[PDB]
Design a protein around this motif. Structure first.
Motif, mmCIF file in Angstrom:
data_model
loop_
_atom_site.group_PDB
_atom_site.id
_atom_site.type_symbol
_atom_site.label_atom_id
_atom_site.label_comp_id
_atom_site.label_asym_id
_atom_site.label_seq_id
_atom_site.Cartn_x
_atom_site.Cartn_y
_atom_site.Cartn_z
ATOM 1 N N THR A 245 1.197 0.471 5.225
ATOM 2 C CA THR A 245 0.610 1.639 4.593
ATOM 3 C C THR A 245 0.629 2.850 5.536
ATOM 4 O O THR A 245 0.599 3.983 5.076
ATOM 5 C CB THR A 245 -0.824 1.374 4.095
ATOM 6 N N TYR B 189 4.584 4.040 4.909
ATOM 7 C CA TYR B 189 4.961 4.498 3.565
ATOM 8 C C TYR B 189 4.151 5.693 3.072
ATOM 9 O O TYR B 189 3.012 5.926 3.477
ATOM 10 C CB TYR B 189 4.869 3.340 2.546
ATOM 11 N N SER C 280 1.739 7.562 0.950
ATOM 12 C CA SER C 280 0.547 7.039 0.302
ATOM 13 C C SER C 280 0.514 7.389 -1.190
ATOM 14 O O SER C 280 -0.239 6.789 -1.951
ATOM 15 C CB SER C 280 -0.708 7.571 0.994
ATOM 16 N N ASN D 1 -1.417 -3.361 6.817
ATOM 17 C CA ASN D 1 -1.900 -2.109 7.391
ATOM 18 C C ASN D 1 -0.785 -1.219 7.971
ATOM 19 O O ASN D 1 -0.825 0.002 7.811
ATOM 20 C CB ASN D 1 -2.935 -2.391 8.485
ATOM 21 N N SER E 71 3.901 5.071 -2.515
ATOM 22 C CA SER E 71 4.104 3.769 -1.849
ATOM 23 C C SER E 71 5.513 3.190 -1.956
ATOM 24 O O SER E 71 5.683 1.982 -1.798
ATOM 25 C CB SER E 71 3.124 2.712 -2.383
#
Ligand SMILES: [Zn+2]
Ligand SMILES: [Zn+2]
Ligand SMILES: [Zn+2]
Ligand SMILES: [Zn+2]
Lengths: 69, 69
Positions: free
Chosen positions: A13, A16, A18, A10, A21
């Motif tokens: 994400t 980074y 989206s 989690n 990635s």
């Protein structure tokens, strides 16, 4: 421990971009507050897709702001 | 595993406000690109400290931008 892997997943994400990635968030769109990597922001500009990937609000190159962390 | 704890620790400090460590980053200073939580940004304004905690560049309330993730 899997709950720790999940928390790692989690947080990763959140940090980074989206869209790819692969790169850290480092560029905000000033018109809506959403943040991506600079690479993706400019490829989207080079493709004449001037709507935010997340909320579809419109923007241009001036609306782009380099952001740290 | 300790290497995974360490990675959790680094990603956490990327996501959280560095000033309070209790809130997520959600507010950028448009004059320098550094990002904090909104709470800390406004307490610093209420204390007439109008220099960025990180790079000491000057800013005001207009230079504040809400940012997501
Ligand atoms: Zn990207
Ligand atoms: Zn947006
Ligand atoms: Zn804070
Ligand atoms: Zn700064």
């Amino acid at each position: 421990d899997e709950a720790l892997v999940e928390e790692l997943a989690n947080f990763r994400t959140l940090v980074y971009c989206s869209l790819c990635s692969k790169n850290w968030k480092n560029m905000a769109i000033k018109t809506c507050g959403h943040v991506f990597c600079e690479n993706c922001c400019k490829e989207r500009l080079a493709a004449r897709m001037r709507k935010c990937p997340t909320c579809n609000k419109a923007f241009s190159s001036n609306d782009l702001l380099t952001v740290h962390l």
